[PDB]
């Protein structure tokens, strides 16, 4: 299928995932997987297959 | 006289005079004279003398 997408922007500043942490014991920032953060962010047919994306963190501290 | 001034800033972005103009016939931006636009902007005894600062524009179009 056609996905024509016309974005004419005068001016644009786009910020993706932001990680800010102050006065933290132990810090683990988890950013990854499938993230698209452009001015014209277009994503299609992501993992149309069997597999899938997974962004997971392994902090336990038992 | 004493003018102790203690400014401890975590983070600061300061913008001076801003000139934005779109679709203008004839443009004359006049920024000058005595302008101080720092993070810690301190001005004292400006033209304590006879003279004075003057920021003037000479547009007539008669």
Residue numbers in the entry:
A (entry chain C), B (entry chain A): 36 to 97
What does the paper say about this structure?
Mutations and multiplications in the SNCA gene, encoding alpha-synuclein (aSyn), are associated with familial forms of Parkinson’s disease (PD). aSyn, an intrinsically disordered protein, has been a significant focus of neuroscience research not only due to its central role in PD and related synucleinopathies, but also because of its abundance and function in the nervous system. aSyn is primarily concentrated in the presynaptic terminals of neurons, but is also present in other cellular compartments including the nucleus, and is thought to interact with membranes adopting helical conformations and tetrameric structures. In pathological conditions, aSyn is thought to misfold and accumulate, forming pathological aggregates that disrupt cellular homeostasis, in a process that may ultimately cause neuronal cell death.
WES identified a novel heterozygous missense variant in SNCA (NM_000345.4, cDNA 174G>C; protein K58N). In contrast, K58N adopted almost exclusively 2PF conformations. An atomic model based on the 3D reconstruction of these fibrils at 3.7 Å global resolution revealed a similar protofilament fold as in WT fibrils. However, K58N fibrils present a higher twist (−1.29 degrees vs −0.81 degrees in WT fibrils), and a slightly shifted protofilament interface, possibly due to the proximity of the mutation site (K58) to the interface stabilizing residue (E57). Additionally, no density for residues 14–25 was visible at the periphery of mutant fibrils. The findings from cryo-EM data revealed that the K58N mutation preferentially results in 2PF fibrils with a similar protofilament fold than WT fibrils, suggesting that the mutation stabilizes the WT inter-protofilament interface. In WT, K58 may form a salt bridge in cis with E57, which could destabilize the inter-protofilament interface and thereby favour 1PF structures. In contrast, the K58N mutation may prevent this interaction due to the altered charge properties, thereby promoting trans interactions with K45 of an adjacent protofilament and thus favoring in 2PF fibrils. Altogether, these results indicate that the main effect of these mutations in fibril architecture is the modulation of the WT conformational landscape, favoring either 1PF (G14R) or 2PF (K58N) forms.
